[PDB]
Ligand binder design. Structure first.
Ligand SMILES: CC(=O)N[C@@H]1[C@@H](O)[C@H](O)[C@@H](CO)O[C@H]1O
Ligand SMILES: CC(=O)N[C@@H]1[C@@H](O)[C@H](O)[C@@H](CO)O[C@H]1O
Ligand SMILES: *[C@@H]1O[C@H](CO)[C@@H](O)[C@H](O)[C@H]1NC(C)=O
Lengths: 49, 48
């Protein structure tokens, strides 16, 4: 087997074509950016999540 | 042929999952030939 797959038919494991070893693949960290604001009418300091 | 002929259709590893593949397969409980090519029968036998 050249590589691997998961339930959703997406790559989850691959073999180095040169050397025979198994390494799993996961997406690098990503997510949403949420801004915590008390309101422009009240202040301008905010916290980002 | 009761239940044989199942082969890996791709070079992808899967585990703890059921995958449906549409590919040339031997039907389950199919009918396969039974060629012998050496029929040793008779009082002294033969090599048909
Ligand atoms: C730009 C803005 O939000 N201005 C409001 C103003 O209309 C309001 O009267 C006050 C308190 O009542 O707070 C501030
Ligand atoms: C064309 C065809 O079906 N040929 C034979 C059938 O005559 C037989 O009854 C069956 C036995 O399971 O094996 C097959
Ligand atoms: C391919 O080459 C590398 C270095 O040139 C070597 O370490 C590796 O074992 C080779 N792959 C083989 C022999 O399958």
């Amino acid at each position: 087997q050249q590589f691997g797959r998961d339930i959703a038919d997406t790559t989850d494991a691959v073999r180095d074509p040169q050397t025979l070893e198994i390494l799993d693949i996961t997406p690098c960290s990503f997510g949403g950016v949420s801004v915590i604001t008390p309101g422009t009418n009240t202040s301008n300091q905010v916290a980002v999540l | 042929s009761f239940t044989r002929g199942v082969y890996y259709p791709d070079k992808v590893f899967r585990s703890s999952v059921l995958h449906s593949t549409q590919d040339l397969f031997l039907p389950f409980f199919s009918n396969v030939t039974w060629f012998h090519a050496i029929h040793v029968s008779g009082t002294n036998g033969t090599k048909r």
